[PDB]
């Protein structure tokens, strides 16, 4: 089994990359595609609060993303891993770190401590970082402040990878999507074939 997470800002081609990579891995592996809350009842209820929340305090929002993460992990991820599946998860811990921690200004290490409470040692076996430049990302989408938030999300991701370089595999997402799909597939297969 394997727990593979996908990270990157909007315009990184993340969603396209997961779909095509799932299509190829399913020939050789029992693989599932997921994202939080991913249909988990309690997680779905939390998602509604996040999306209905008008000017919600940033720390509350961070705790809700972490509570949805726990539910999804416990009820969806862990049982799929026990069935021997390869789990392709669209966004996990690093998304809270880059968004809530860095871009929102709470601080990466504070959002990390929160998320380590939520994941309880369950870090991904592999994390695919779709390394898109702010310029390519902006064009790939789809206002200022939004442009600034997008850049800050990317700066946050740069900070996460610079401090932790083990499970992270940075794929050049500035390339055409066919090459991003191939580089991601090859990275995954190489990891999976080494157990």
User: Under the criterion CB under 6 A, does residue 34 sit at the interface with ligand 13Y?
Assistant: no
CB of 34 to its own copies, least distance (A): 17
CB burial of 60-78 (b: ≥16 within 10 Å; e: otherwise) equals ebbbbbbbbbbbbbbbbbe
**Residue 95 is a binding residue for ligand 13Y (CB under 6 A):** yes
On whether the CB atoms of residues 126 and 111 are closer than 8 A, the answer is no
Q: 101, 164 in Cβ contact below 8 A?
A: no
The reply to whether 103 sits near its own copies by the rule CB under 8 A is no
Residue pair 65/91 in contact (Cβ under 8 Å)? The answer is no
From CA 127, how far away is CA 130, in angstroms rounded? 10
Which positions from 132 to 171 touch its own copies by CB under 8 A, shown as an x/- string?
Answer: ----------------------------------------
Q: Is 8 annotated as a binding residue?
A: yes
Q: Which of these ranges, 64-72, 73-81, 126-134, 176-184, lies near ligand 13Y under the rule CB under 6 A?
A: 64-72
Q: Judged by CB under 6 A, which of 3, 6, 29, 65 binds ligand 13Y? A: 65
74 near ligand 13Y (CB under 6 A): no
Of 5 and 184, nearer to ligand 13Y (C-beta) is: 5
8 A C-beta contact, residue 21 and residue 184: yes
Binding residues for ATP: 8-15
């Amino acid at each position: 089994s394997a727990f593979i997470t996908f990270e990157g800002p909007e315009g990184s081609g993340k969603t396209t990359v997961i779909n095509e990579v799932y299509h190829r891995l399913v020939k050789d592996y029992d693989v599932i595609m997921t994202r939080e809350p991913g249909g988990v009842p309690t997680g779905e209820e939390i998602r509604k609060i996040v999306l209905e929340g008008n000017d919600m305090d940033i720390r509350t929002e961070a705790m809700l993303f972490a509570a949805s993460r726990r539910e999804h992990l416990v009820l969806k991820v862990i049982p799929a891993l026990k069935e021997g599946k390869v789990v392709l998860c669209d966004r996990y811990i690093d998304s809270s770190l880059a968004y809530q921690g860095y871009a929102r200004g709470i601080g990466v290490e504070e959002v990390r401590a929160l998320n380590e409470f939520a994941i309880n040692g369950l870090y991904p076996d592999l994390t695919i970082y779709l390394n898109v430049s702010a310029e390519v990302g902006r064009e790939r989408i789809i206002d200022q402040e939004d442009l600034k938030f997008h850049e800050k999300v990317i700066e946050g991701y740069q900070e996460i990878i610079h401090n932790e370089s083990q499970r992270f595999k940075s794929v050049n997402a500035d390339q055409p999507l066919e090459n991003v799909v191939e580089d991601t597939y090859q990275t995954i297969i190489k990891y999976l074939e080494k157990i």
